[PDB]
């Protein structure tokens, strides 16, 4: 018979890390989650209550609810062809605080402060990001570095 129950195949997945076990520290409990927070989901084996199904491990979603010990998180999973809307009630030991968006705020805020530099001066803005570029012409000095010339090495057995 085939065996498909809830936590099957999670053996290595829900394991706590080598030399990290026991009680979970207080940074996890001392974190505040309001609605709209974008959180990463990773289960914790020490806490059995209110933990994600193994699917949502690694997924990231926006918390839609805040309750006593848990936060409801709305997540998007695909079934057939579409994404339906899943909402999980998960405890805080299983919730991270996602660094995905965090930098975007530190981007916008730096963008508005560089806007005042075109307001107080009038130079061109260059706000939107541009990907890495072909580089450029340069000159490489032979001074103190003269190219040392290599050949291929023959074949010899090392054992």
């Amino acid at each position: 018979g085939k065996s498909h129950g809830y936590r099957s195949r999670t053996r290595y997945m829900f394991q706590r890390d080598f030399r990290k076990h026991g009680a979970v520290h207080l940074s996890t409990y001392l974190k505040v989650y309001k609605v709209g927070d974008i959180v990463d989901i990773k289960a914790n084996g020490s806490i059995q209550k209110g933990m994600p199904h193994k699917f949502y491990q690694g997924k990231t979603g926006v918390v839609y609810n805040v309750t006593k010990s848990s936060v409801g998180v709305i997540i998007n999973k695909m079934v057939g062809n579409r994404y339906l809307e899943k909402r999980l009630n998960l405890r805080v030991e299983h919730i991270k605080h996602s660094k995905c968006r965090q930098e975007f705020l530190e981007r916008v805020k730096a963008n508005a402060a560089k806007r005042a530099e075109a307001k107080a001066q009038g130079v061109a803005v260059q706000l939107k990001r541009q990907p890495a570029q072909p580089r450029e012409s340069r000159i490489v000095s032979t001074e103190g570095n003269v190219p040392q010339t290599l050949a291929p090495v023959p074949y010899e057995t090392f054992i």
Partner: protein, 172 residues
């Protein structure tokens, strides 16, 4: 790997804030063009130092013409090559008027008697044989003798008309 050129190919690791001015490295590469030679370069350098082409850059590439191209020379050729069951090293001697012409005939010989395609051959060193009498392989020595004359018997002359009106002769 078609009809051959020699290239000085000079390349280096990319410079870092830690280390500006990393060391330049030069290889002489026998290839058919600059795209292969540049690629050929990174092939061996990745067999020598820790560099990718992604991590490095090429500083220069320059063709090297023969200095005395109408002067007959005797060449030593050091070759590493993989064979069907193993990979081994060889010394061969080639007599020609350039290094290119000699590498050109090098790869054919490695194809003809050892079945060695280009990809399985490394050219370790190719240098001119300084004197005579330092020439090892005897198939070169035959043409080193004093006042060397030989015939070319049994002359076969390509025809044009598909029918010919006399029994031909080979007499040269």
């Amino acid at each position: 790997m078609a009809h051959f050129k020699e290239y000085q190919v000079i390349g280096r690791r990319l410079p870092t804030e830690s280390v500006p001015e990393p060391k330049l490295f030069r290889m002489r590469i026998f290839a058919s063009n600059e795209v292969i030679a540049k690629s050929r370069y990174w092939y061996f350098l990745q067999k020598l130092h820790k560099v990718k082409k992604a991590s490095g850059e090429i500083v220069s590439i320059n063709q090297i013409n023969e200095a005395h191209p109408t002067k007959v020379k005797n060449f030593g050729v050091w070759v590493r090559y993989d064979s069907r069951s193993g990979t081994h090293n060889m010394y061969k001697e080639i007599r020609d008027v350039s290094r290119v012409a000699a590498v050109e005939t090098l790869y054919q010989d490695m194809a003809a008697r050892h079945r060695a395609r280009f990809r399985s051959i490394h050219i370790l060193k190719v240098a001119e044989i300084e004197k005579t009498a330092d020439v090892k392989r005897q198939y070169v020595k035959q043409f080193l003798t004093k006042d060397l004359k030989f015939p070319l018997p049994h002359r076969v002359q390509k025809s044009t008309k598909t029918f010919s009106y006399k029994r031909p002769s080979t007499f040269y």
